[PDB]
Symmetry: C3
Subunit: 215 residues, 3 copies
């Protein structure tokens, strides 16, 4: 069940989080796509493939469908429409695998309601702050992205799926990590991505209900 | 005129605000619905009936249409579509009664534009912060709900009706009540609901222009 | 290229910014519209005509189409639909002139996605904070308008055009001007309007890239 997860940790395919995400995309160079790919083909496991509109992502999907083996969660970058998810859904249906979409673009953000409602196999949406800000021409800070975040959480809640917050960049700014994570929880995010295991415990704790609440 | 009104005070049907709202809903227990109903049936007056999608609300509406007597304002909880308001409007076509809708759900919020335009009898919308927060999975604090609030004020303003802010929970935090009320006024709320008479003078004062402003 | 511009200065027809806007509208009295009109008919130049839904604006357009001469930028107030811009576009297809729409109303804001996509001739959108706040019944301050600004910037970014921030009212509050300009920049605005030449250097400087960026 996707709602229980609190921490999603990105580690590149080349080489305690609640979910590990094997990454084929932005951490992986263009030259490394085939090597990271087949490595990955070899506790719930996620795989972020390259975008459907990339040759890398077509290759990734082809390899997945051939060598048989699939993660519990397929993470699709630059999810921009419900058709993005429905294509994956139909593709994965031949050969129990659930989808996670990333909302990292304006186009994606404008269609977020229909994206969140696209298919039962969708298990959550990740906010992509850095690309969202870059697409808009904004700073990565909270305030310019606050609209986007609130709109994302609402679409998730409307469809009974968790909103997963963007990763926090500064591994060294534990204060900043604590503040942003708390802000996301108050907004209604159920989880937050991460790019370093040092962030995990902070993230786990803050997205964990209190004994008072559990009662 | 609804725009002049500043304070809306909820008092349960069982038993100086500009409008009093006799409540059949959340303050009244389920066992108490019949008592409160007929007692309520017994300066402008509002009645909040139970939701249209509840057996309680059907009975309330049945009793209203039967025993003849109607308030100046009919307050509908959990307004989620234009049809909600139009059904009441047609039901009220036999037997001068105006409607107030409550936006307390994501579904309501997403349809807020069409709701604000639903019928001429609609005289205003109340924000239901606590249920909205719960529906989203967010905290009741200002920030997670600012989008929801801004979207509500805008749809109201477009249809020439006042936006009425949620009641403030903490009766003891007068500071918090002043701050939120001022925030709501700045946003374009023209009025605010209340759950205790101690809040009334504060709400009235803060929504009353100053001699400085009038000059 | 509109993206290069940082400062847009409104000056009434009656009487170093990157673009000067000769203004026929709110700075010009109604008695002065004919007067102001014909002077203007006699470094890139912008012209804000009166609204299409005003007798003044029809006359302004008539005068423009007759005496042959057109500004580099035609600035249209109260842009409320895609048709607003398309009408102007077709009117000036005979006699290189690009359009700038002003989003200053709730109706304009709700249609901002379709306005920003209306025609290739559209080169940017200006936020009209003072009319937007008044239309909503809100204060002119940042917070009540933050949702509106984020929605405007998003629509611009999606269509490959710059968002231009509203002018800051207080000429004497240089601190407020600096703060608003930075917030706008962070939000993803590429430029900001001005209503007095004293504001120009501040706006220019703050929208000028640092050596770190340039590298």
């Amino acid at each position: 069940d996707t709602y229980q997860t609190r921490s999603w940790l990105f580690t590149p395919a080349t080489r305690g989080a609640d979910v590990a995400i094997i990454d084929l995309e932005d951490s992986v160079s263009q030259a490394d796509k085939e090597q990271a790919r087949q490595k990955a083909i070899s506790l719930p496991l996620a795989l972020r493939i390259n975008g459907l509109d990339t040759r890398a992502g077509i290759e990734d999907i082809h390899a997945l469908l051939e060598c048989g083996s699939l993660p519990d969660y397929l993470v699709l970058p630059k999810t921009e429409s419900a058709a993005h998810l429905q294509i994956l859904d139909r593709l994965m249906m031949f050969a129990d695998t659930r989808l996670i979409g990333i909302i990292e673009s304006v186009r994606g953000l404008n269609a977020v309601e229909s994206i969140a409602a696209a298919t039962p196999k969708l298990a959550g949406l990740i906010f992509g702050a850095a690309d969202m800000a870059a697409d808009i021409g904004a700073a990565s800070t909270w305030e310019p992205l606050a609209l986007a975040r609130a709109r994302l959480v609402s679409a998730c809640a409307m469809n009974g799926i968790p909103a997963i917050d963007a990763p926090f960049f500064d591994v060294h700014d534990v204060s900043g990590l604590q503040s942003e994570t708390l802000r996301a929880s108050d907004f209604g995010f159920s989880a937050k991505a991460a790019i370093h295991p040092a962030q995990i415990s902070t993230i786990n704790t803050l997205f964990t209900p209190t004994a008072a609440e559990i009662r």
